[PDB]
Design a protein around this ligand. Structure first.
Ligand SMILES: [Mg+2]
Ligand SMILES: [Mg+2]
Ligand SMILES: [Mg+2]
Ligand SMILES: [Mg+2]
Ligand SMILES: [Mg+2]
Ligand SMILES: [Mg+2]
Ligand SMILES: [Mg+2]
Ligand SMILES: [Mg+2]
Ligand SMILES: [Mg+2]
Ligand SMILES: [Mg+2]
Ligand SMILES: [Mg+2]
Ligand SMILES: [Mg+2]
Ligand SMILES: [Mg+2]
Ligand SMILES: [Mg+2]
Ligand SMILES: [Mg+2]
Ligand SMILES: [Mg+2]
Ligand SMILES: [Mg+2]
Ligand SMILES: [Mg+2]
Ligand SMILES: [Mg+2]
Ligand SMILES: [Mg+2]
Lengths: 143, 60, 69, 80, 145, 63, 206, 67, 142
RNA sequence: UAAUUGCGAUAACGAACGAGACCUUAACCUACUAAAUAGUGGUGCUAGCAUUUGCUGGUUAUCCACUUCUUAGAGGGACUAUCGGUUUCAAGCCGAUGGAAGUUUGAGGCAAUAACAGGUCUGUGAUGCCCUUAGACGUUCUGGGCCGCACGCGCGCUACACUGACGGAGCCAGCGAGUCUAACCUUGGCCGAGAGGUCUUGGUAAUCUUGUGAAACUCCGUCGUGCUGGGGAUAGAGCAUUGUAAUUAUUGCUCUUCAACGAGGAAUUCCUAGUAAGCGCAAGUCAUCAGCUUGCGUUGAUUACGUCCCUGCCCUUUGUACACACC
């Protein structure tokens, strides 16, 4: 009786929406996406070649939904990793910005987000409504 | 807290000892609402060496 | 060398054995058979079809299954 | 005009190390005796109402191998 | 559930690009035995050859094989980008290449011979046998050979 | 095997030229009509219980 | 157990298996008795706790260490060898997994299984390096009840540690393959082999 | 370890001798009494005195103390 | 109107967990999210422990707001468990009667895993000569 | 006793320096004074799930109230308190109770007398003397050198993996720094696999960067003991950034080459609680470049609560043919 995504387990929520988004057929997976590493920090490309893009989109949705407005930068650092430099010590390195941007462009194409004042993206009432809906769905995954 | 950290030694001999200096900068502000005589009086009546003072107009 | 492909012969071994063991996990399969470990992990998803084995804790690192029911 | 130099006298030069330090300098420069320059400074501070005074001259006193001499009178602390 | 069988179909150890390739090890990594295919290249070729990565190279139809071998020597033609490659912009031909097999050692030799023939600094060290990138030689890389 | 329980009564002090072995006096637990001095490897306080193998011996100073 | 509701859910496996008895992860602390006296007061299994992790403040005084639940002292002594230090979170999971393996392997309380293991593993008498003279002999002495608990865990954790190294098995498994072979000293246990040999050396050089 | 210095104990004796009726067996009241009949340059010191002075009282009042 | 609320907090290292306790239908929320979700994980019952030591039912008549800053994934937990705990008793201090309160108060401290008294350990400063506060750079002599 | 710290013994009595006091910093404060450059409750305006009121957000001031959380002024606070065991029943030590705190509360700053041919004239427009001063040892300009590699040695870094690697995903710090007659920290938008590019922006700063969304770490999945997808040396090819200038690879990026290393002989360093260890981060340096250092916080233990066996020191006893003092 009155659900937010905030009542949902993160790996629960974000798994579901990634499947719904993929099934929805409507999004915009970029022309690469099969060749890309998501960060220079990383070693290899994502193992779920199929739906990792769906996985991240999902994540970003829920992440901006919980904030006020988040930019392409932040998304690089949030999804930032630790980079091995071989015989040198590890440091933190940001992610590919095309990835997190193209998400944040193909997430207004379905109006989940929008540009914000102050900069970066905010969550749309279109999207806010969308997630709280499929929040409650994975909520009542109890038969 | 300003922090300057260097070696006690000149040259480079002896145990690798270090020193660390500080400068402590203290700030505060008070807001007033007063006109013609109380404005130019208070900037100057309250004055003292070592104490930096500054008053601001308003708006932007 | 182990075994990373079902031999049918190797397959028969499984369900006509695994309910012997009151404890089975990734390793438990590997040493009693000569399973891959990769396929051990799929054989365990599989062996929770119609619970040939029953769970008590499923975890990324460690899987703990017991005899039948 | 926005900057103006002022002039003070002093708060009894016997209590200021710098005014004393330079006094040892000048006195020594004016040819004076090592030990005398020392005590004469010491006794000015001491008779300026201090609690103590210590003057330490290092360098070549009687030439060649350098040494150091300490002339103190009264009370000092060193610690905290 | 990838619990299936396969009869005589499975064939351990097959041969590509003049190399011998294990079959009971993963495609992505089975192929990486060849001089020139690392994980990132072998991950991509396979993608472009409609190959189910959930497999061992002891599977993979001899059809799926040529489909991979083909993409490997014409990658730039299968929506593989030039940067992904191990020899872009040649020095004698100017074309984007990606060498493999015994053919990588060959163009490693050519390259050395090249700037050795020219008797430049870099080339000399290679011939001598010193370290050619500006590292100190004073205290490291000892025992040699 | 004739294992014997014994309760600590008093901590005399520390021998061993290292300072590792501690002297103690034990109350033979089952039969309290006995009281003997033993050497210990670990940290011992008063009142805790020790488990004696050869139940005679009774040693003294050490290095 | 009188299931009470409130605004934000709070499950039945929570509500019940808590406010009733304070089960462990969910094992009962009651009825677990320290078989073998003398080592009591030191194998702390009497103040129940849900998880093996507390704001432990046990190393100021000398035997405050003994008011630490022998579970946690076990789960602490896990996290070591450089690449493991600090990682208590990991160790705790390794433990939770260990007890579950054990309860599957021999019914019973795995918390009683763990205790039984500690007791029969702690060396009763040890050998100290005496002065001796040149080729310095080695004196035979008994060891404190506090070290018996200490050395137990040590051997035991090193038991599972060294075992599961370059081996398929997981720590959780070899932790059970080292506790079960010790709670009934099969002598197929690193600790138990180690213990019987300390005493062999102790019954001797006295 | 915790050994009180001379300047401490020196003061306690001095305080006690010329203020036994005024002082009690209680730390806090004594602590306060110090601010009246003595001028101590810091709080920790003043408490430390007040603390040893209160210590002697608690044994003085059980038999005469040597000094 | 303004509701009868009370406010306490929990600290553990650099973590400081603000708590809000008003009469309510029994919500117990950390950072705008159900306590049943606090998924630093194996430590879940570390945040539950104030709720079950005193009885789940004492909370049916109170709404809890907790939110945390600073520290880490593990220091925060201890900082909120201590906020709730310090809150239940504070509500009961201001709004109920004493004898009830020290049922609650005595319940915790008999079990106290810090719960209502703040663990005061802090980091020690590094000294020059070593990467640690006690750890010294390796020396070599001759 | 950490202490020439104290009780005491006392031909000594009474004192000063050093130790202690002192200062800093870190812990407690619902007690005081305050806060649009710090927060919170309510109230408008507005969004979504629910609709049974509710749960969750947005709004730089809509308007009001406050100071718990933050900041920093003023004070409070501990004195080893209280009881108990020891002891010349003295200094004190130990234990238990409470207490924010009971190891000098933790950690530092400061630190006497006397001394060493210890280092520094290459920090100084500090300096004696010698040297040289226009074929200059001064100065500036062009290029090279300090990094040259059969090898000895020290400080490190990264590792040998399954308590792991890789991929997703969860996501939490504290110490800090930053542009005027200038180009520092840089959000955001776009572009680019990346590195980086481009158009704008805020900030001389509790206000903008920045909640510095740090790594360790947590979940889920792949890998399955094989020099393996552990390890990332050496090397080829290409793209960018700093700079006049990158060759003897400044750095960064991408593909490819895939070494030694399977726990390290004799030896040997460092450490007792938020410590060790692991983890990264800011600051110094800096046009560019950290595998270095100065600090910071995150995760967080095993073992001691001791002794003089080894190794140093310190007092006393003792020997001396040493006093330029066992070189
Ligand atoms: Mg991160
Ligand atoms: Mg990540
Ligand atoms: Mg590395
Ligand atoms: Mg490091
Ligand atoms: Mg003094
Ligand atoms: Mg001092
Ligand atoms: Mg290859
Ligand atoms: Mg003295
Ligand atoms: Mg405000
Ligand atoms: Mg408001
Ligand atoms: Mg207490
Ligand atoms: Mg120089
Ligand atoms: Mg050099
Ligand atoms: Mg060194
Ligand atoms: Mg790798
Ligand atoms: Mg990971
Ligand atoms: Mg390899
Ligand atoms: Mg340097
Ligand atoms: Mg003599
Ligand atoms: Mg003599």
């Amino acid at each position: 009786p009155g659900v937010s995504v905030r009542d949902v387990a993160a790996q629960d929520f974000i798994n579901a929406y990634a499947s719904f988004l993929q099934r929805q057929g409507k999004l915009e997976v970029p022309g690469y996406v099969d060749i890309v590493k998501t960060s220079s920090g990383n070693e290899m490309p994502p193992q779920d070649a199929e739906g990792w893009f769906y996985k991240r989109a999902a994540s970003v949705a829920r992440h901006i939904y919980m904030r006020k407005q988040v930019g392409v930068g932040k998304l690089n650092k949030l999804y930032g990793g630790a980079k091995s430099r071989g015989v040198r010590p590890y440091k933190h390195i940001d992610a590919s910005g095309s990835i997190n941007r193209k998400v944040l462009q193909a997430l207004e194409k379905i109006g989940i987000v929008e540009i914000s004042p102050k900069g970066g993206r905010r969550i749309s009432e279109n999207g806010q409504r969308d997630l709280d809906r499929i929040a409650a769905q994975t909520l009542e995954e109890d038969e | 807290v300003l922090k300057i950290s260097t070696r006690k030694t000149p040259n480079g001999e002896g145990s690798k000892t270090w020193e660390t200096y500080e400068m402590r900068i203290h700030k505060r502000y008070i807001d007033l609402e007063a006109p013609v005589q109380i404005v130019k009086r208070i900037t100057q009546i309250t004055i003292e060496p070592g104490v930096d003072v500054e008053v601001v107009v308003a708006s932007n | 060398q182990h075994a990373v492909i079902l031999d049918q012969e190797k397959y028969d071994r499984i369900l006509k054995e695994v309910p012997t063991y009151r404890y089975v996990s990734v390793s438990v399969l590997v040493d009693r058979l000569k399973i891959g470990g990769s396929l051990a992990r799929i054989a365990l998803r599989h062996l929770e079809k119609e619970g040939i084995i029953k769970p008590i804790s499923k975890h990324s690192k460690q899987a703990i299954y017991t005899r039948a029911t | 005009g926005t900057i103006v130099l002022y002039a003070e006298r002093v708060q009894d030069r016997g209590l200021s190390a710098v005014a004393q330090a330079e006094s040892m300098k000048f006195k020594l420069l004016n040819g004076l005796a090592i030990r005398r320059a020392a005590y004469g400074v010491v006794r000015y501070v001491m008779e300026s109402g201090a609690k103590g005074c210590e003057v330490v001259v290092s360098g070549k006193l009687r030439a060649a191998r350098a040494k150091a001499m300490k002339f103190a009178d009264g009370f000092l602390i060193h610690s905290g | 559930s990838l619990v299936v069988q396969e009869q005589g179909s499975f064939q351990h150890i097959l041969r590509l690009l003049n190399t011998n390739v294990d079959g009971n090890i993963k495609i992505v990594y089975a192929l990486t035995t060849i001089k020139g295919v690392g994980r990132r290249y072998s991950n991509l070729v396979c993608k472009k050859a409609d190959v189910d990565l959930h497999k061992r190279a002891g599977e993979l139809t001899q059809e799926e094989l040529e489909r991979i071998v083909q993409i490997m020597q014409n990658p730039t033609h299968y929506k593989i980008p030039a940067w992904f490659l191990n020899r872009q912009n040649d020095i004698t031909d100017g074309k984007d290449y990606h060498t493999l097999a015994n053919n990588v050692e060959s163009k490693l030799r050519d390259d050395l011979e090249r700037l050795k023939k020219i008797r430049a600094h870099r080339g000399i060290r290679h011939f001598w046998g010193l370290r050619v990138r500006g590292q100190h030689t004073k205290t490291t890389g000892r025992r040699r050979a | 095997t004739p294992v014997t329980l014994a309760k600590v009564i008093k901590v005399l002090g520390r021998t061993g030229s290292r300072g590792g072995v501690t002297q103690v006096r034990v109350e033979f637990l089952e039969d309290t009509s006995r009281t003997i001095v033993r050497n210990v490897k670990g940290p011992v306080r008063e009142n805790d219980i020790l488990v004696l193998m050869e139940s005679e011996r009774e040693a003294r100073r050490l290095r | 157990f009188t299931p009470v509701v409130l605004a934000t859910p709070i499950p039945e496996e929570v509500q019940q298996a808590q406010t009733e008895i304070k089960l462990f992860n969910k094992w009962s602390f009651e009825e677990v008795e320290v078989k073998d006296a003398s080592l009591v007061d030191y194998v702390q299994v009497r103040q129940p706790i849900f998880v093996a992790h507390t704001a432990g403040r046990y190393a100021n005084k000398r035997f405050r260490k003994a008011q630490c639940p022998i579970i946690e002292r076990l789960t602490n002594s896990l996290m070591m060898n450089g690449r493991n230090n600090g990682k208590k979170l990991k160790a705790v999971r390794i433990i939770k997994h260990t007890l579950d393996i054990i309860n599957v392997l021999t019914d019973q309380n795995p918390i009683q299984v763990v205790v039984d293991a500690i007791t029969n593993t702690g060396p009763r008498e040890d050998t100290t390096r005496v002065g001796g003279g040149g080729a310095a002999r080695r004196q035979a002495v008994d060891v404190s009840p506090l070290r018996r608990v200490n050395q137990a865990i040590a051997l035991l954790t090193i038991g599972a540690r060294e075992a599961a190294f370059r081996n398929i098995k997981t720590i959780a498994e070899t932790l059970a393959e080292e506790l079960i072979n010790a709670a009934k000293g099969s002598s197929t246990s690193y600790a138990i082999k180690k213990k019987d040999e300390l005493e062999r050396v102790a019954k001797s050089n006295r | 370890g915790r050994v009180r210095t001379k300047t401490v104990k020196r003061a306690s004796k001095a305080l006690i001798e010329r203020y036994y009726p005024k002082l009690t067996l209680d730390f806090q009241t004594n602590k306060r009494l110090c601010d009246e009949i003595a001028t101590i340059q810091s709080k920790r010191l003043r408490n430390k005195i007040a603390g040893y002075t209160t210590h002697l009282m608690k044994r003085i009042q059980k038999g005469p103390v040597r000094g | 109107s303004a509701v009868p609320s009370v406010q306490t907090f929990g600290k553990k290292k650099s973590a400081t967990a603000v708590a809000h306790v008003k009469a309510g239908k029994g919500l117990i929320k950390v950072n705008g999210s159900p306590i049943t979700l606090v998924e630093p994980e194996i430590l879940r019952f570390k945040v539950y422990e104030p709720l079950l030591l005193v009885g789940l039912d004492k909370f049916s008549n109170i709404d809890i707001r907790v939110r945390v800053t600073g520290g880490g994934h593990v220091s925060q937990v201890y900082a909120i468990r201590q906020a709730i705990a310090k809150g239940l008793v504070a509500y009961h201090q201001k709004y109920v009667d004493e004898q009830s309160k020290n049922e609650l108060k005595k319940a915790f401290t008999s079990y106290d895993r810090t719960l209502l008294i703040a663990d005061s350990r802090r980091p020690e400063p590094k000294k020059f000569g070593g990467k640690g506060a006690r750890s010294r750079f390796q020396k070599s002599y001759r």
